[PDB]
Design an enzyme around this catalytic site. Sequence first.
Site, mmCIF file in Angstrom:
data_model
loop_
_atom_site.group_PDB
_atom_site.id
_atom_site.type_symbol
_atom_site.label_atom_id
_atom_site.label_comp_id
_atom_site.label_asym_id
_atom_site.label_seq_id
_atom_site.Cartn_x
_atom_site.Cartn_y
_atom_site.Cartn_z
ATOM 1 N N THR A 15 0.804 -1.211 0.000
ATOM 2 C CA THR A 15 0.000 0.000 0.000
ATOM 3 C C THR A 15 0.841 1.267 0.000
ATOM 4 O OG1 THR A 15 -0.166 -0.092 2.412
ATOM 5 C CG2 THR A 15 -1.901 -1.167 1.136
ATOM 6 N N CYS A 16 2.164 1.151 0.139
ATOM 7 C CA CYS A 16 3.019 2.329 0.041
ATOM 8 C C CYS A 16 2.917 2.957 -1.342
ATOM 9 C CB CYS A 16 4.467 1.958 0.361
ATOM 10 S SG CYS A 16 5.182 0.717 -0.741
ATOM 11 N N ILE A 17 2.878 2.128 -2.383
ATOM 12 C CA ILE A 17 2.587 2.572 -3.736
ATOM 13 C C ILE A 17 1.278 1.991 -4.253
ATOM 14 C CG2 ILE A 17 5.023 2.935 -4.240
ATOM 15 C CD1 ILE A 17 5.070 0.331 -5.730
#
Lengths: 636, 96, 645
Positions: free
Chosen positions: A609-611
């Site tokens: 979920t960071c990208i």
Amino acid sequence: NWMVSIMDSTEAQLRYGSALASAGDPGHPNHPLHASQNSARRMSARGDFLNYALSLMRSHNDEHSDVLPVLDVCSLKHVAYVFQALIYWIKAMNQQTTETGQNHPFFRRSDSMTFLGCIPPNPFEVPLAEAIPLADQPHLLQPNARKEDLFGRPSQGLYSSSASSGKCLMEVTVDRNCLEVLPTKMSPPLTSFRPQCSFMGMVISHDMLLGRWRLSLELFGRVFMEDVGAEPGSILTELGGFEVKESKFRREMEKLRNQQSRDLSLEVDRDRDLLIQQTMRQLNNHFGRRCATTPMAVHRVKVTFKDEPGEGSGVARSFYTAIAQAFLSNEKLPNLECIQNDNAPLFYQPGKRGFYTPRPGKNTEARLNCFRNIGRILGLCLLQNELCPITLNRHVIKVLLGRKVNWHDFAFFDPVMYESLRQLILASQSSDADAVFSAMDLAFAIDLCKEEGGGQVELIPNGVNIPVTPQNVYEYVRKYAEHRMLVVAEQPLHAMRKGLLDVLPKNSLEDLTAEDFRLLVNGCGEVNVQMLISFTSFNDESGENAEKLLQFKRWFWSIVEKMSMTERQDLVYFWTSSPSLPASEEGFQPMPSITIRPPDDQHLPTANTCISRLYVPLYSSKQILKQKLLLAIKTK
Amino acid sequence: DEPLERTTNSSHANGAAQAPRSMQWAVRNNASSYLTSASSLARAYSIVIRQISDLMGLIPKYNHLVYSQIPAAVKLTYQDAVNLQNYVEEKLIPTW
Amino acid sequence: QRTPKKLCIPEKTEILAVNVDSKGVHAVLKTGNWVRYCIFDLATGKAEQENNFPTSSIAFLGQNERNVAIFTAGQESPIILRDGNGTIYPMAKDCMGGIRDPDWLDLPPISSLGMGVHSLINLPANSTIKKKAAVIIMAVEKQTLMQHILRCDYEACRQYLMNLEQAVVLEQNLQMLQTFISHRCDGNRNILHACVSVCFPTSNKVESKDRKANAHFILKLLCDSVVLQPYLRELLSAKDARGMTPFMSAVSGRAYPAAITILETAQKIAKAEISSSEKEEDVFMGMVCPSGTNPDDSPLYVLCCNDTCSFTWTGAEHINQDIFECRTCGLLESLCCCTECARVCHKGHDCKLKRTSPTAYCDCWEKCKCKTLIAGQKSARLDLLYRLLTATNLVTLPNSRGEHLLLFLVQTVARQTVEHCQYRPPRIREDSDMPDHDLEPPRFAQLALERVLQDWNALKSMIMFGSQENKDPLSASSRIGHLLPEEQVYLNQQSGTIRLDCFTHCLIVKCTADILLLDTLLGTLVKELQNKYTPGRREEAIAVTMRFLRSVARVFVILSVEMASSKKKNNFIPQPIGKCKRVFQALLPYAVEELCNVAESLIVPVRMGIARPTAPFTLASTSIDAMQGSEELFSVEPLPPRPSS
Ligand SMILES: [Zn+2]
Ligand SMILES: [Zn+2]
Ligand SMILES: [Zn+2]
């Protein structure tokens, strides 16, 4: 004259199409609301010109029944520029020129729902299913949604009834020569000039002109917005839909978020009680100083957990989702006595499921601080361009924005009581009103539920003994609505407004309505397959076969489309750590993507979920793919 | 046989797909040029004007050419002819 | 199953008759005015198979509701069904699995129907002969005059009527007279229905011809009988199982002299009838075409669409023609019926058109009973057309596809000109059940179109189709009363010209064979333009002429735009544009004005700078290419209304 002719003709064609759409078979290929008319997904040039010529010949003598007029509004940009210039002139000269009971401001529609130049439907005769369709179907709110199908179809006080002029008569006629002969046939100190905007032999107001050409203006704003809408004093921008307002708001938030020196840097965990406690403590600590200046802002907001490694924006989205779902759970809150160093659930659902209003309690300073903090987190979600799913009622967000709550918000509060009061007042208009009022024996006091506080509250002093009479029902109803809009929840609404304004300036908060705020905060109401289609990029790291990866995406979208609401929300959570998609592409700081790893028999797909990217193996077996995806999205 | 599109960044020219679903019929987008349509409409107008000219030329010999030969013909008088010519001139004044 | 168990039935549904066989339990159910036939399986316990009767529900219910019955032996035996009037309703299964259009057995009502299963024994050496059979015993009522009519006995009917009138003079036979008026046969048919049924043709030219002559004599005797004068009004207004009065049955069955007799008798009765809150038209149309009948059962439409089968002239050899497939009868996968068979034989079946149509022939005879094999009398057909045109207002009503009678006739003529050029005359150069196929292709469409075009009311209705008054069911602007008034204003401003454009296109550019149709239309328009004695006729004629001229101008403009003015060979005109020029010349003072308006309509966007961009296109160098494109543009249908609400 030229512009009036062109605009009246094009309005007549669009209006005819709308009427025919409403009166035709949606399954027929010739229907306006058919896939074949999409103009982007999909005859001969000779056929096109022959259709154009036949339409031109037919519309000249009112013989166009049962066929859509052939027009290309995208080829009328010069007409749009001329109309904009003339409207600028009219508005400039007009600006240079410039109680109770049944007719009360509380019963009148506000700018949020009203149409410029058109008489709004009466709040009593038309039922809720037609006057305010959004109340009956709360899922109609989409980034591209017409105002007509959200708040009813307006009417205009036009046509020959008490009218003998071209502008007083509606367009109706479809050609361009009759609508050209119509405008032709109708035809001291210096500081007190006082122009008149005579022009067409009558006083011209831009409101009636806007109402006259409503469909044309809507289509112009939708189509011509990169060029015509960029002009100074443009009325397409002034009357812009959700797109212009959301782009402006997001750019303003980007401006307001890129000049601060210190970030927020909270410290919260994944449990229930300690999450709330640490959130409140950190929010209090960050917003604390002697004689605080104008509302401070945070350049970034990062969320750090305990015994759980993770950095980026996915953790922030997960924190937003968790804190919102925690504050929206119907169970007793943990005590907040550590703030300085009674326990009813915060929000409840008065009307349709999914929408919440504050629940008053003992008005303790802890609860007020909690409401201020929830306002602060709403403002943070606004500033950080992150979706925080907490769907408040329309009147709650309206009073947060600082607008005036009207009687049509009672439809969003509780439709059943809205219908009951509408029927009551409609019967009150009749002669037998007194008998019914005496039979039911109303009084200026309401039996509020335990949710509202229980007991019974008097609307006006010495009003318990005073009954409700047909000669004074309206005030009653207003008081009724007032006592369920602002009287019961004055303190919580004020606290939420203070919290929201503590992080966002008033100037940027303006030029926003309830629907746009809902679409920016809560995202789209429900996750749509086409919305995911609009922003999803596929990359493959296997390169085993073209057909395999060409069909894998088709299978993925097919299995996603067949899912239901809860598993779709779980999938979007496992993908982007936020149940609700953003309204538009802007809002996803990374573009969502799916990476097709080399095929493997047993490897459940992962997601960062960071990208906001999924990593899925090339599952040859469809059922195994479905099982793996379902088990992956089960976890939270 | 006709599939949809499942991708992103598909924006060539464009500027018309933003129209509402209810009004997509009123919006488009080998050449699709304005001048071709103008020329074709002018050609059709010229055809109609030529036909009007031929009919008006048949008026002086209407009885010999139209009335006797065709079984069904409309009787025409002098005042009708002069009013007809006035009507045609009045209609053709603007384009003139 | 020691305990009785329920059989699920829909709510508020009455049971009329139930019987139990091996296949399950059979029942007839009625809700409101909807009679069905259901078979329940015991294991399922619910309605396994429900079917709707092709005939009307009112006819099945009949005069008495308690006569409905079902008969089955129980183990292996068919179902015999008995309707309200007391007669026997044939049952059969189509290819889809419903009740077939019954072929009436002409049996009088049955008072008792015994039925038993009987095992046959003493079979020599166990031959292939079946071992068991059902014995059906029947008690059929003795209806005197009904059987006299069905047997076609003139003397018997004459004697019965004489005895009846003598008894009426005696004034002692009122009850039996009322009972005789209430006599019925299969299909809810009265005595006049029986006369019409026996008047039907059997083959192209007790002897069959003698039987037909006796049937005509009996029908005339019934019509002119003195005793039955007060009772003919109810008999002629009675509807059979298909919702047809005796005149409608006569027209459908091609008993045209019988239809003429019934029509003149109906006019005589209407003239001699009391005016007790009843008009002449309301009492005549009640027995010619009663209100509520579907448009496809209108006598005039049926008369025009009766025709004859394509197999009757094509023979067994393939011919390029439009081909229809019927789901119900099983005409699928190389089993095809002609366009004439799709309008009569399969009127109501799930019949559609095969878009990909190879050269084919009609085999309606080998899949179902064909009523289009035998053609009636031409002179009587034309006379009936004349009388229906000059006596009623049926020509104003459209049919189920929303097209006026004139439009249907023009399309029929256009299709027939193309198809009948494939006719091979009987050149002089094993299958016995094959239909007779030595008759000319039908030539009634041209004559009908010529006669109808001569009618002012018909032409006025056609040209004014889609206007404020005239409206067709298959148009979105037909029912608009449930919409907002703002939308209603826009829908009421415009008028309909799609049907008129189709009419003009099929009359000018498609009906290429003949030129007298356009001349007939122009003659009628001119006659009404110059009419002065009739008040208001000149203005109405002017309006009709203007509308028709606008349609012709549109067709002319499209055709001329498609074509290219090649200087070679100095043709200077195609055939259709010549027809448009002829129309303009014949109606010059108004044609020039309408052309001026059309030219202004075409040129206004050019000189206002609002022309809609269009891609370049090539110009057709031949008329066969110019006909296409225009065909796609004009031969289109209006937008249908929104189903339900
Ligand atoms: Zn056939
Ligand atoms: Zn069939
Ligand atoms: Zn047949």
